[PDB]
Design a protein around this ligand. Sequence first.
Ligand SMILES: Cc1ccc(NC(=O)c2ccc(CN3CCN(C)CC3)cc2)cc1Nc1nccc(-c2cccnc2)n1
Ligand SMILES: CCCCCCCCO[C@@H]1O[C@H](CO)[C@@H](O)[C@H](O)[C@H]1O
Length: 329
Amino acid sequence: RPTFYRQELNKTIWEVPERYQNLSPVGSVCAAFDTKTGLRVAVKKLSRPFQSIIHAKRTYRELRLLKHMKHENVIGLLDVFTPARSLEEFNDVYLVTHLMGADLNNIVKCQKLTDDHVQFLIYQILRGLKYIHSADIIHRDLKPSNLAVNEDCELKILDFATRWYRAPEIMLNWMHYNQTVDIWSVGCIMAELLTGRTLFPGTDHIDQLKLILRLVGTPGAELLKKISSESARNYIQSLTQMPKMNFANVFIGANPLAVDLLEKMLVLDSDKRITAAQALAHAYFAQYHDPDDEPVADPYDQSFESRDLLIDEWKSLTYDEVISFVPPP
Ligand SMILES: Cc1ccc(NC(=O)c2ccc(CN3CCN(C)CC3)cc2)cc1Nc1nccc(-c2cccnc2)n1
Ligand SMILES: CCCCCCCCO[C@@H]1O[C@H](CO)[C@@H](O)[C@H](O)[C@H]1O
């Protein structure tokens, strides 16, 4: 067991192994210098991990999730620790990842992208997503500030305005969503990268749905067939502004294939939305698409998700996960 040390930061007690030095708060996440490796790291101290049942499950969910992600386009776990010598002391959890230089927002402000940047950047997201999706994990909150990019235009997916990127079925509250909610988002992100501006800058969610509907159009028979509620079906029709544009005239100076890919991602009907795996093979990624370098996830046991347990059991589960962690090489 390493030796620990205490520090008060922006009115909060951080205690970490001395391995991590020079903590400085970026937002409760500090940047720190991992002296084992000389690399800058990010340290998250989970707020009130075991305060309620809901908190306890999320603590656990995030640990499991971080312990599973092992792909170059997705954030991974360097370290997890607790200053606690035992289960009974266990009340803090800290997670460690690579520190990130920039997110997609920063890249946006700082340089105007080549077509070739947009291809390489979206390619990485999709390759990340084919790996998340293959584990039956749905991101749900893809947006530029959750995409980290280094100096070589390499990208990692993480999770820390969200709605600009949300699939419309989420904003119309179905209890059941599939993985292609994440593809809606990728298309919102791509569009932004090519156009320089936000595709649906909605003041509120109904504003969002309106902008969506005038660009992609009102749903086909085939999709109206799948909506059970008359109220829903009426409400949707109730938009209802100046018609399905052109789409292609919103992106006029862009690469014809980019625009084609975007047409297959920004499909109202999530049954018809292109998947990450299919999107990988779309001609717009001809420069990067390598079929033998696009791996899928190991089996991932999320039977815990359906489970309703006591704080202490969630706290115990989380403790086993902490104790059994194996650092990467
Ligand atoms: C230190 C840490 C601990 C945990 C996480 N967690 C995650 O990144 C994550 C990734 C994917 C998911 C996927 N997921 C599936 C289900 N749902 C609903 C969404 C979540 C969730 C959390 C990130 C980090 N890293 C992190 N977080 C925020 C900011 C920074 C950071 C800040 C500044 C400079 N460099 C890095 N670094
Ligand atoms: C206002 C524009 C939004 C129209 C409704 C979005 C259509 C979303 O698509 C729907 O996704 C569901 C969610 O899992 C699936 O069950 C349905 O099969 C699919 O058609």
